[PDB]
Amino acid sequence: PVEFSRIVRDVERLIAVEKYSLQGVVDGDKLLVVGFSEGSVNAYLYDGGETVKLNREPINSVLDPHYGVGRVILVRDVSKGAEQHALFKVNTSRPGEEQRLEAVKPMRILSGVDTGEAVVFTGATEDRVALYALDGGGLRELARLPGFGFVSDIRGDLIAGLGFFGGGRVSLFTSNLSSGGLRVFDSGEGSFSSASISPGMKVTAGLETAREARLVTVDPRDGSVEDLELPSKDFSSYRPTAITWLGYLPDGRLAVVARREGRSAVFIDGERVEAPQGNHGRVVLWRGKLVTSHTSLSTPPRIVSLPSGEPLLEGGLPEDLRRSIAGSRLVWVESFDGSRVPTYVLESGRAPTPGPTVVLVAGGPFAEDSDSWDTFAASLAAAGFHVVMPNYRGSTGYGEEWRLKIIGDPCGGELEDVSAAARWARESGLASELYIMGYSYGGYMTLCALTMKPGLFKAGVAGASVVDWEEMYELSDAAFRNFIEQLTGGSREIMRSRSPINHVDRIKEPLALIHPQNDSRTPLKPLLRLMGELLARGKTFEAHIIPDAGHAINTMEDAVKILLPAVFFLATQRER
Amino acid sequence: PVEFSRIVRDVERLIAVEKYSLQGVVDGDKLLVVGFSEGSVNAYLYDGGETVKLNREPINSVLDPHYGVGRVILVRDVSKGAEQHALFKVNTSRPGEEQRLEAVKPMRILSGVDTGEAVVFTGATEDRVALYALDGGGLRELARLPGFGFVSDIRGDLIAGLGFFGGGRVSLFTSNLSSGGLRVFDSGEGSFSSASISPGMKVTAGLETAREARLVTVDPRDGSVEDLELPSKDFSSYRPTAITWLGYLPDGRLAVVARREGRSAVFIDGERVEAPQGNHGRVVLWRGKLVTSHTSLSTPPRIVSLPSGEPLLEGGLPEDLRRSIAGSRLVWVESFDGSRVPTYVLESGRAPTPGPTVVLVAGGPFAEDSDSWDTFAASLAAAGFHVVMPNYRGSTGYGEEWRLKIIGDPCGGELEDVSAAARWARESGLASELYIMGYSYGGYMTLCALTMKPGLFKAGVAGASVVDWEEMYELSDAAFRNFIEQLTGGSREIMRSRSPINHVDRIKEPLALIHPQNDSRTPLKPLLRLMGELLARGKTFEAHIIPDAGHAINTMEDAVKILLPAVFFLATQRER
């Protein structure tokens, strides 16, 4: 067959491998890392080499610590997957002892920074997206935001952040920790992707324009925007198309992680710092060393020091799993309007060529398939599927223009891009048969593909999918309502005609639906209706609804429950 | 630390182990066996060193052959699980060459016998249950049956069968191969469970009465019923409570399989024949040898020779799996009205005592938990659960009275019996925590327990369940409609108040639903509505819907798909 237990062995070990992200430096000279480890997402202190777990129960994230703070603020879903987060203070000297910050009622916590004195975060409720501050004086709403907004940085009383305030464009906003308020700075030529407040109290920001990315400095007093000149020209000669992150280190140096073609580079004051190939996260100064996270299509996220590339914290892949990843490459696929779609390809060592191939669209929109570890891809390659990961228009990493092409056109141009990648897989000799697997917006895309292009794929997996923009809209909080509005151009007609529930008649291929029951992003309710329509029309479908879980998986149990049936489904369709 | 891959390895091997049932003897000294082997239900010829697969694709069953016929009639679902069967002739000299008997439209085929000249079977369509004959003269409907009915035996032109024609009682019926018609013979004292036509053209039948079982002779000409006395008294001394099967061997000897307390014995002309402990199936004479099937709670069904107990065809369990079954016993649990519920207990070698215990109700009503192999039970024992298997009222094997107590009272006394067994598991020291898992009527029972006895189990798994008697009834064929009528006493009020869909508000425990999408016995559609109600009320639930599959699983793939989520769910609930 289908060797069920081998698939589970592989899949469970791919989930289990330790994955780390770098969050900052606390209690002077310890690293704060968030890790998938011991079967869950935990927060750890590292001093090189005890690793001390800070939380009891699994968490969802931590707020960004300012350097050397004596505490950590854990963000934990207290609603079984619906992402109503509560905040939990852990004093770094007493790990495992948590104190719920009761002043803040549960809400979808978006981002946040802890200064040591005050906790500043963005959060969404049913009625609003807001910027909040929690200090000794209690909880304050500093400003109501138009849409999704994220805190990037705080310096003194200045708060800087990124707002998604319209048309899919990203604005810079500032507020004040004392008085509050909101100053919004839009750019005419692109979107801001990252921000940090310089010692001079200006905001240095990554600006992503039509094709290129550059650094600018915004004076929040008068809104003047000037190009930031760096003492070294490595950065400008790199020609970056996206900025992952930037930050002023404690010693005043500007650290920038920028990318092109799905791989990043680290720059300090414009000077290129040697880094392992792949993608990098924030950069911290730690014991006079530059530390970052590093990942690639074959390297689970790990903490490395620069420029040596020396691992501080890494999970190692078993060798049999390493061998299953034959290799990766970037190809440029010609789409329907002559656009080239940057597609990452992961060749399985366990499949022939041509071989069964899954087009994997996970996450999105405004996500990117880069040279970064993907558990879905690895687990498909381990199961003997080649993987094609298309950066369809609406993806990030290739400029503002490519990313904005999706706005007002869900299940339009981007679906053509995904189809073009499928076609490329066959025509180039990669794929003997095509499947599509998607999660989130990708799950939405699976349903659009099967409804709009029947015959292209042999079978599809839709995880945590959008099936109806309209009912979803009705069920969404203020952040997601606004995001749907932006995505659809505020057009209720687009909401309707681009909803695959309205084109179920067209489905010819077998489909597996996987949905966490408490998903508050892509709710289950509409999915039940789709299943009724599939049943009434005699369609072949498989469905799996996962209990006490939502869009954000933070345990191995849930991860296995979401991922295993997807792989079993494909493995089984492969034998037919 | 739920070891997913370890459970998968055990469960896939437990499904994979070959399981055989004896069907008869063909072309003239070959055994006809139906086996789960090579991952599917197949028909084989066996001659004592070769096993020859007769079918191409997986089948559901074969019709009973008269000794030595040069063909086999396979019954295969041609509706992807909905159990609309076609019949397929295979000439035993040309295995793998099938010929669909196109004169017979697909229908739910219930039973059948092939004389070599004529194929006689019972079948249910939307509007009728009927006795049919297919000879060279085409298809003929011999008689319309009141409800479920099964052909038992044909001799010359006399057809004998068992009919469920009212009040849960089982009637003997006869018809004629030439003229057709229907003679029905009811007994006042009990139900007929088996029948065979003697050389003298009378019907020998197993009569199951209030407490004991006995053999009678029925003269179809005048309807006289007289006790059959046998030359040997071992059978009467045995005090059997049920008859499994009886048949006249080609030499005129009467073979009887009778059971008591979930274990059978074999008698030839009333004379006990040594047989391996457990349960036995039909008995054939093959090359001057008595051959039967044999199974026990630790022995997957196999073909053995009597009286030696010599295996002819058996799948061997791996050692590790054999040891996981610590032991079994029969206990008598006091129920709510003083009745003793005969419950089989399977102790797991991999659980402590007290230990996590699953009350397993699979199949039913009119089924029995006996000392017979159960893949669900073994696979729970292997995952570290003790298994408790109660013969609630409505079960067979303990007399007519116990079996008929369910009539008009679904989700009543029998649920009390199931709860009493759960209570006993805890009181006696076996169970540290209780779960309930059920399939088919057992699935119904899971839903009844969670709605009617919240807090009794920690969680439940309802597979292929009844959720609404009313909607199911609207979607049922003529056989199931009649059966629902019989079970509910034809009362629309019982249908309504005993449907767990009407009690969803009451569920406090996590619940996993498993359902094949084309189930035509317990349809999916009412399940979708249950899920909507569970969602709307904030209930924790897991659901798996299996594509292209129905109530009767005949492949490994489908079995894994139904069984794996059930075990994973319990194993995960166990860590709490």
Q: What is the CATH number of the domain that holds A509?
A: 3.40.50.1820
User: How are beta strands B158-166 and B149-155 bridged, if at all?
Assistant: antiparallel
Is the same domain home to B87 and B178? Answer: yes
Report the structure determination method.
Answer: X-ray
**Last residue of a domain, which of A274, A296, A316?**
A316
β partners of residue B334? B340
Distance CA B147, CA B480 (A): 8
Report the number of secondary-structure helices (H) and strands (E) in chain A.
12, 37
Q: Which amino acid would we find at residue A383?
A: A
Alpha-carbon span B479 to B124, nearest angstrom: 6
Structure tokens at A559: 């991860």
A324 in catalytic set: no
Q: SS3 for B159?
A: strand
Q: Are B13 and B28 in contact (CB under 8 A)?
A: no
- CA B541 – CA B544 distance, rounded (Å): 10
The verdict on B516 touching A (C-beta cutoff 8 Å) is no
- Two tokens, residue B456: 């009794």
Helix B556-574 to helix A556-575 angle (10° resolution) is 180
Pair (B472, B371) in one structural domain: yes
Pair A268, A367 in one domain: no
Do the domain assignments include residue B65?
Answer: yes
Whether A494 maps to a domain, the answer reads yes
Name, in order, each residue with C-beta under 8 angstroms of A533's C-beta and a sequence gap of 6 or more. Answer: A501, A504
Contact B531 A525 (CB under 8 A): no
Chain position carrying tokens 């310089």: A198
How far apart are the CA of A572 and the nearest CA of chain B, in angstroms? 8
Same domain for B307 and B371, yes or no, is no
Residues A472 and A514 in one domain: yes
Domain co-membership, B393 together with B309: no
Q: Write down which residue in B290, B316, B342 finishes a domain.
A: B316
Residues 6+ apart with CB under 8 A from B536: none
Degrees, nearest 5: CA angle A500-A504-A510: 105
SS3 category, B252: coil
Distance of CA B573 to the CA centre of its chain: 29
Look at residues B454, B380, B443 and name the one whose alpha carbon lies nearest to residue B419: B454
Q: What is the DSSP letter of B445?
A: H
- Best B520, B535, B548, B564 member to test A by mutation, with max A CBs in 10 Å, is B535
Indicate the residue of A548, A561, A572 with minimum beta-carbon distance to B557: A572
Contacts of residue B9, defined as CB under 8 A and 6 or more positions apart, other chains included, come to: A5
Q: Is A554 helix (H, G, I), strand (E, B) or coil?
A: coil
From residue B224, give the alpha-carbon distance in Å to each of B153, B159, B184, B207. Answer: 19, 17, 12, 14
**Best B528, B562, B564 residue to mutate vs chain A (most A CBs within 10 Å):** B528
In whole angstroms, give the CA distance from residue A148 to residue A154. 18
Q: Which residues contact A29 (CB under 8 A, 6 or more apart)?
A: A47, A68, A286, A287
- Same domain for B63 and B203? yes
A354 reaches B (C-beta below 8 A): no
With contact defined as beta carbons under 8 Å apart, do B146 and B165 qualify?
yes
Chain A contact present for B537, CB below 8 A = no
User: Do B278 and B219 fall within a single domain?
Assistant: yes
Phi, psi of B570 (to 5 degrees): -65, -40
Q: CB of B373 within 8 A of CB of B19?
A: yes
∠ CA A385-A391-A394, nearest 5°, is 140
Residue A70 and residue A48 in contact, taking contact as beta carbons nearer than 8 Å: no
Catalytic residue among B194, B374, B551, B558: B551
Query: What are the structure tokens assigned to A313, written together?
Result: 């914290």
Q: Out of A316, A351, A384, pick the residue that ends a domain.
A: A316
CATH of the domain at A23: 2.130.10.150
Q: Per the domain annotation, does B2 fall within a domain?
A: no
Spatial separation of the C-alpha atoms in residues B255 and B512, rounded to whole Å: 44
B71 in helix, strand or coil? strand
Q: Is B522 inside a domain boundary?
A: yes
Chain A contacts in chain B segment 22-51 (CB below 8 A): 39
Q: Which positions ≥6 away from B314 have C-beta within 8 Å?
A: B18, B20, B300, B302, B303, B304
Is residue A74 within 8 Å of residue A88, measured between CB atoms? yes
Give yes or no for A271 touching B (CB within 8 A): no
CA distance A551 to A527: 14
Q: Residue B319's CB: how many other CB atoms inside 10 A?
A: 8
- Domain assignment present for residue A218? The answer is yes
Sign of CA dihedral A430, A433, A439, A443: positive
| In a domain? residue A364 | yes
Rounded Cα gap, residues B431 and A210, in angstroms: 66
* Encoded tokens for B217: 């002779």
B343 and B460 assigned to the same domain: yes
Q: CB neighbours (10 Å) of residue A508?
A: 12
Cis peptide before A354 (omega within 30 of 0): yes
Q: Which long-range contacts (CB under 8 A, 24 or more apart) does B290-294 make?
A: B290/B255, B290/B266, B291/B22, B291/B31, B292/B22, B292/B257, B292/B266, B293/B20, B293/B21, B293/B22
Beta strands in B450-548 (DSSP E): 460-463, 511-516, 541-546
User: Would you call B525 and A535 a contact, using CB atoms and an 8 Å cutoff?
Assistant: yes
CB contact B460 to A (< 8 Å): no
Cα angle value A400/A403/A405 (rounded, 5°)? 105
- Optimal mutation site among B542, B575, B576, interface A, most CBs of chain A within 10 A: B542
Task: Estimate to the nearest angstrom the gap between the alpha carbon of B162 and the chain centroid.
Answer: 16
Cβ atoms of A500 and A447 within 8 Å: the answer is: yes
Nearest 5°: phi and psi at B500?
-60, -25
Burial A161-186 (b: 16+ CB within 10 A, else e): bbbbbeebbbbbbbbbbeeeebbebb
Is A386 annotated as catalytic?
A: no
The rounded distance, in Å, linking the Cα atoms of B67 and B29 is 9
The span from the CA of B563 to the CA of B375, in Å, is 9
Residue from B463, B557, B497, B506 nearest A575 by CA: B557
Question: Is residue B42 assigned to a domain?
Answer: yes
How far is the C-alpha of A77 from the C-alpha of A86, rounded, in Å? 6
Within this chain, do residues B272 and B350 fall inside the same structural domain, yes or no? Answer: no
Q: Quick one: how far is CA B329 from the chain centroid?
A: 21
- Interacting residues of A130 by C-beta distance below 8 A, sequence separation 6+: A122, A123, A124, A141, A142, A143, A144, A145
Angle between the N-to-C axes of helices A413-427 and A441-452, in degrees from 0 to 180, rounded to the nearest 10 = 70
Q: By the CB < 8 Å criterion, does A321 face chain B?
A: no
Break sites following residues in chain A (C–N > 2.5 A)? none
The secondary structure of A61-86, three-state, reads EECEECCCECEEEEEEECCCCCCCEE
Instruction: Report whether A459 contacts A512 (CB < 8 A).
Output: yes
Query: Is A425 found in the same domain as A308?
Result: no
For tokens 């086999």, the residue is B72
Residue A423 backbone zone (phi > 0: left; psi -120 to 50: alpha; other: beta): alpha
Q: Are B343 and B369 in contact (CB under 8 A)?
A: yes
Q: Looking at chain A from residue 66 to 125, which residues have their Cβ under 8 Å from any Cβ of chain B?
A: 80
Whether the CB-CB separation of B195 and B160 falls below 8 Å is answered with yes
Q: How far apart are CA B557 and CA A7, in angstroms?
A: 14
Q: Is the Cβ pair A540, B517 closer than 8 Å?
A: yes
Residues B218 and B100 in one domain: yes
Give domain status of residue A237, yes or no: yes
DSSP for B298-315 reads TEEEEEEEETTTEEEE-P
CA torsion through residues A542, A547, A549, A550, sign: positive
CB within 8 A of A505, min separation 6: which ones?
A537
Structurally, chain A folds into a number of domains equal to 2
Domain that holds residue A292: 17-316
A532 touching B, CB under 8 A? yes
Residue type, B296: S
**Short-list B559, B539, B570, CA closest to A557:** B570
